[PDB]
Design a protein around this nucleic acid. Structure first.
Length: 69
RNA sequence: GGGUGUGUUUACCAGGUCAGGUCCGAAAGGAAGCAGCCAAGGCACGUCC
């Protein structure tokens, strides 16, 4: 379960714009998304890292449930 | 090394465009700009000087 899927599924159109600023590699291996990328992704989707760093948290809570059942 | 062809590769660090999103503006409208793509470069191979 990568970001690509997590995308399928107001505050929504912004949680998407934040993914639309990533690269295919990222949308697959979110881990590699450390500091510098996090940055690029914020400013690209017009956000604050807190936003990007936020979504990643969501993909995680989400990843977990998924990689559980 | 140069021209050119092909395959492969390349998050951002003043190339072009820029979905999406952001910015400024009461508005009309401006502004920067990620991903993509194009371009460019890297690695090879073919070919020409």
């Amino acid at each position: 379960f990568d970001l690509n899927d997590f995308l399928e599924q107001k505050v929504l159109v912004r949680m998407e714009a934040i993914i639309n600023s990533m690269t295919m590699k990222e949308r697959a291996k979110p881990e590699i998304i450390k500091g510098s990328r996090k940055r690029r992704i914020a400013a690209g989707s017009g956000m604050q890292v807190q936003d990007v760093n936020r979504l990643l948290k969501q993909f995680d809570d989400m990843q977990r449930m998924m990689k559980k059942m």
